[PDB]
Amino acid sequence: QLKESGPGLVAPSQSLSITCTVSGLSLPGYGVNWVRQPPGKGLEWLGMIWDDGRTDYNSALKSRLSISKDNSKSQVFLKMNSLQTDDTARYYCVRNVYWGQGTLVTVSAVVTQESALTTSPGETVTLTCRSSTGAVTTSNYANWVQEKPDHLFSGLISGTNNRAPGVPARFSGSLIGDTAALTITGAQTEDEAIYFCALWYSNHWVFGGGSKLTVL
């Protein structure tokens, strides 16, 4: 499990410090990611620290960000200076398919998904995830993350097609044409939610705009 600890409220042009505290027995994946969601906007990848200690950053934010770790305290850190108003958002740390509940901070390549879809219980539905740079392959390690009311995030599929533990068998990840695809076979009412895909581009993640699946 993962748990963010943030100052709640930060002043414009001052700096932001969030601590991600990592607890449990197993550590799936290869490091710890920082992601944020501005209120009412989509998910945005911020950066990652690998288990060897190396870091990658959202290039658009690289100049203001620094990520570190304290292996003795089992924690990973996010620092961002020069806080702007558009920096208001929930901040999540994520390891593989596990997301923390996030902390809300208030300041004092393109991936395209179907924007909306409707289905009926027992019918099968497919969601798609297109890259603007070309075809999607397993080298992109397609992730599918389910946001269920309202800011709780859970990884459904990682590595294009690896079902996360405890995820119902009706969810399967695949490639279809040049897109990544998430198939919900025999959808149920409990699958009404928002589904985000993310694609790996050699040194950074990029999230899609998310799909609102309504189940009648």
Ligand SMILES: CCCNC(=O)NS(=O)(=O)c1ccc(Cl)cc1
């Ligand atoms: C090896 C090239 C990329 N692979 C990778 O990042 N694997 S990971 O640690 O398990 C991971 C899973 C989901 C997210 Cl969103 C972020 C990281």
